[PDB]
């Protein structure tokens, strides 16, 4: 039983975007189905529900601009978002609700929607290597991108222990920067290569940067 979302991205204010939620293992048309969004600092906001029979209800914040619908043949739920506003920037989840028969038990993975007129900028990625206690730190600096988010991994996701990716800071230029770091044994530095992988979907960029000791 899964809900798989698609359709997120960057859109300018006043524009439109349609999100999709393809269900497997449950029939969308036999269920209450919802869209719930999570903006910065705004917790979870339940913006729409569609009843099994097709009646729809909206939060006041989106009423008249957003439309929930479904395609039974594709077993897919949609959120058509028109007249988008900066305030609509959020991760959007679809979910199956059971109401008093079970709560909201199944959630999609979430898709990011960013509403902005600012220009898109792919990140610049630089290695953080010691100039060289038994432990070494390595990292990558991810500089001056827009919009959020980037996704940073190490060794294609195989290195997760000891990784810390810092929150991005919005610079006075209007672009974001962050670093990602990992700690490893100093004795491992000559025995293998460490690579940071930086993905930025809005610019369709994927950067792999080797972080070699100096």
């Amino acid at each position: 039983v899964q809900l798989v979302e698609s359709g997120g991205g960057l859109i300018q204010p006043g524009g439109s975007l349609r999100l999709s939620c393809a269900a497997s293992g449950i029939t969308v048309s036999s269920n209450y189905m919802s869209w719930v969004r999570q903006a910065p600092g705004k917790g979870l906001e339940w913006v729409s529900v569609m009843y099994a029979g097709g009646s729809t209800f909206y939060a006041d914040s989106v009423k008249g601009r957003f439309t929930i619908s479904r395609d039974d043949s594709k077993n897919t739920l949609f959120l058509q978002m028109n007249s988008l506003r900066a305030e609509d920037t959020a991760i959007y989840y679809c979910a199956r609700d059971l109401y008093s028969s079970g709560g909201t038990d199944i959630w999609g993975q979430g898709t990011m929607v960013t509403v902005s007129s600012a220009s898109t900028k792919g990140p610049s990625v630089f290695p953080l290597a010691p100039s060289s206690g038994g432990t070494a730190a390595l990292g990558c600096l991810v500089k001056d991108y827009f919009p959020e988010p980037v996704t940073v991994s190490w060794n294609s996701g195989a290195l997760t222990s000891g990784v810390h990716t810092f929150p991005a800071v919005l610079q006075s230029s209007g672009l974001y920067s962050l670093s990602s770091v990992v700690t490893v044994p100093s004795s491992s530095l000559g025995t293998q290569t460490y690579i940071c992988n930086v993905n930025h979907k809005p610019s369709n960029t994927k950067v792999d940067k080797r972080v070699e000791p100096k």
Binding site: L44, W46, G103, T104, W107, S124, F126, V181
Partner: protein, 213 residues
């Protein structure tokens, strides 16, 4: 409209203790119309309890819900670092329903000193004309820390910025980056670059430095 108010806003408790979270509705809603969710960093919300007290499939007994009318409680027993999350109540007595504002459950630990590392700018960035110098403070607690940057033993001002992670889900510590940004011209005018860290867990401040080139 129905508004849910959660209390407290944040809770900081040691592993092994019991957390008690409250949710009050602005009008009576009934136990049948209330549910609780956990949301860990970077993950989708997870249903814990519905109908005020019925645990969802696979949810362990450490999560327990109670209450009636307009006042509800979630208890989380035997807290562990991995329980770090925002916990939300939800009512579905209206369509759509609504969520509370969340209670952040922080897992307390004992003081831990940072491990400190300094990174020079990459040759790549320097060729482009800018030098970013990074100081890492790794796996410390509590969050408060002071970072001072010194360039040829001269205290720096106005050219640094900090970012701090949320508490780690395995060990409840923080990490922090301090980034000093200089033009290439200014960077090349000085030799010794140092960050000095003061923190509760350090017997004395720790300085890490490198020499340009």
């Amino acid at each position: 409209e129905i508004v849910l108010t959660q209390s407290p806003g944040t809770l900081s408790l040691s592993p092994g203790e019991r957390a008690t979270l409250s949710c009050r509705a602005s009008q009576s809603i009934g136990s049948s119309y209330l549910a609780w969710y956990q949301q860990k960093p970077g993950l989708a919300p997870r249903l814990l309890i519905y109908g005020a007290s019925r645990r969802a499939t696979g949810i362990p007994d450490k999560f327990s819900g109670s209450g009636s009318g307009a006042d509800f409680t979630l208890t989380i027993s035997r807290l562990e670092p991995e329980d770090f999350a925002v916990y939300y109540c939800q009512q579905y007595g209206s369509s759509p329903g609504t969520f509370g504002q969340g209670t952040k459950v922080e897992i307390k630990r004992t003081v831990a000193a940072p491990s400190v590392f300094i990174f020079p700018p990459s040759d790549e960035q320097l060729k482009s004309g800018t030098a970013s110098v990074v100081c890492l403070l790794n796996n410390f607690y509590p969050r408060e820390a002071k970072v001072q940057w010194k360039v040829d033993n001269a205290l720096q001002s106005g050219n640094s910025q900090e970012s701090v992670t949320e508490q780690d889900s395995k060990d409840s510590t923080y990490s922090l980056s301090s980034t000093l940004t200089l033009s290439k011209a200014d960077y090349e005018k000085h030799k010794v670059y140092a960050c000095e860290v003061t923190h509760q867990g350090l017997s004395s401040p720790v300085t890490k430095s490198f020499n340009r080139g």
